[PDB]
């Protein structure tokens, strides 16, 4: 059934699974027309498909050309997501196919179930968790590859960089969700915290700075402070 706080450790067991977030698939700027009407302009999007055990992020770039001459784009976006996830599973050898796909939004269940009819043994699950994967486009290198794409593309990232050499996948997932929760709540403040010390750089193939263990502890503390601060402001408590 549904993934929650109670069955959380399951994400880090040896059954291959993927999270699928479709939030950033269909993206628009809203603007005024010459006649003073409103119109949308689609910009490039992405599917965020993450193995929470290994950090492998299958970033399918959704080029604006996929929306050309289509209607009901917020509905089509869910089905295009399910089509690309299905294609990704079919592309993998049997021993690498997931046993479960967890969708971050319930509206993805039927589109993905229908696209995955050929895989009756893959469980399609919702989650009770409010995961901050929508903030993926606040990670500078992911945003850069999506906006530069001139055609459909899939780019494989490791969203945990080399963290798994030093920490478990439970801890790496916790660090990733804290970073993304921070970026989602206050992107400017979050990015200021991460990039404040210019001595600490981002490796060419990494997404995040090369913090020492002790620097991660300080970074992680600063991210928690940011989230509580913004919370007291949101709710005046």
């Amino acid at each position: 059934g549904a993934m929650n706080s109670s069955n959380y450790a399951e994400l880090f067991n040896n059954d291959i699974k993927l999270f699928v977030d479709d939030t950033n698939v269909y993206r628009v700027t809203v603007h005024k027309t010459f006649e003073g009407n409103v119109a949308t302009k689609a910009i490039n999007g992405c599917i965020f498909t993450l193995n929470p055990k290994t950090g492998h992020l299958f970033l399918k770039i959704i080029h604006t050309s996929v929306w050309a001459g289509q209607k009901r784009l917020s509905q089509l976006a869910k089905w295009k997501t399910a089509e690309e996830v299905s294609a990704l599973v079919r592309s993998l050898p049997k021993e690498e196919q997931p046993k479960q796909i967890i969708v971050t939004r319930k509206a993805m269940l039927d589109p993905l179930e229908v696209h995955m009819l050929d895989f009756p043994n893959i469980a399609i699950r919702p989650t009770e968790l409010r995961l901050p994967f929508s903030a993926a486009m606040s990670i500078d290198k992911l945003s850069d590859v999506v906006m530069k794409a001139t055609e459909p593309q899939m780019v494989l990232f490791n969203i945990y960089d080399d963290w798994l050499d030093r920490i478990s996948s439970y801890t790496a997932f916790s660090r990733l969700t804290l970073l993304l929760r921070a970026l989602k709540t206050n992107e400017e403040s979050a990015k200021m915290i991460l990039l404040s010390d210019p001595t600490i750089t981002i490796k060419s193939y990494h997404l995040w700075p090369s913090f020492t263990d002790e620097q991660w502890i300080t970074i992680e503390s600063q991210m928690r402070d940011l989230i509580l601060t913004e919370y007291g402001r949101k709710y005046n408590v």
Partner: protein
């Protein structure tokens, strides 16, 4: 007009014949039902006074043989049987009629309700859904499960309704996932109508039989089948105009006949709200929408 004699009524029982019902007292001198209209299927059904659990009954067509009811004190139910001896049967019925120990099928002359509920229902199709080929009549009861329910457990005692599953390879063509899921015309017209049922009459026949098993026996699997066959039409953008017009008449009579106090358990809120207000056919069921809005506006 045809007759279904009873040997006797040894146990107190509510007896239904189609949409009519009569109470019979333990050992009341009751010897059956006369003046049954030729040309339709019929159902004769039972609910024991002492165990209102297990409604059960028999689908039959008097054109196919001479049928009678006799209580079996071993199996504890009223059983339909065929009398092969034409003259023994004529002789039994004539006696019981002369002694006026039979109730009359109490059809109002103006009243086409039973025809309207059974228009496309055929005994030959009933006998494929309810498999017991040694008898010309078909036993159904409250607890009998459908082949579809058995998948998700005695196959001899199952309702073999046509399996309909919106999230099945049968319903979804590879490469038309979103198209076939959101507009079920392919599934209705090519798979079901052309492929399995052959024509809309057989489809309506099964729909009508499912409803009547739901209504007369509170058969849950039959109710799921009736709703699934409605929803498949209502979710199809492309349906022949004759089928929509006939569906509106079929559903009108089914809603009209349903006991006012059973709408809570026999009508699926989601299916009806979807069919009448969201679906492709939301404007195609004028008679059904009007009777539903006036009779069950709570459900909607």
């Amino acid at each position: 007009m045809n007759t279904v004699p009873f040997t006797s009524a040894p146990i107190e029982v509510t007896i239904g014949i189609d949409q009519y019902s009569f109470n019979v007292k333990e050992n009341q001198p009751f010897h059956g039902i006369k003046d049954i209209p030729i040309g339709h299927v019929h159902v004769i059904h039972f609910q024991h006074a002492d165990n209102s659990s297990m409604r059960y009954g028999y689908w039959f067509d008097c054109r196919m043989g001479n049928f009678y009811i006799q209580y079996d004190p071993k199996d504890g139910l009223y059983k339909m049987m065929e009398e092969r001896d034409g003259a023994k049967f004529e002789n039994i019925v004539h006696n019981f009629k002369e002694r006026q120990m039979m109730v009359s099928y109490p059809k109002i002359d103006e009243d086409d309700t039973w025809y309207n509920l059974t228009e496309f229902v055929q005994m030959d199709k009933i006998r494929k859904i309810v498999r017991k080929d040694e008898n010309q009549f078909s036993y159904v009861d409250s607890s009998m499960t459908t082949v579809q329910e058995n998948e998700l457990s005695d196959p001899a005692h199952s309702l073999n309704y046509t399996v309909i599953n919106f999230k099945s390879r049968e319903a979804i063509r590879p490469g038309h996932e979103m198209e076939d899921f959101l507009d079920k015309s392919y599934y209705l017209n090519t798979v079901m109508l052309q492929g399995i049922f052959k024509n809309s009459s057989n489809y309506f026949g099964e729909l009508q039989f499912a409803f009547l098993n739901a209504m007369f026996f509170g058969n849950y699997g039959s109710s799921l089948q009736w709703h699934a066959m409605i929803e498949l039409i209502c979710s199809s953008a492309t349906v022949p105009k004759h089928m929509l017009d006939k569906l509106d008449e079929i559903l009108y009579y089914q809603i009209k006949t349903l006991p006012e106090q059973y709408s809570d358990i026999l009508l699926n809120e989601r299916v009806w709200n979807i069919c009448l207000y969201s679906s492709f056919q939301k404007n195609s069921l004028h008679n059904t929408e009007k009777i539903m809005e006036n009779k069950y506006p709570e459900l909607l």
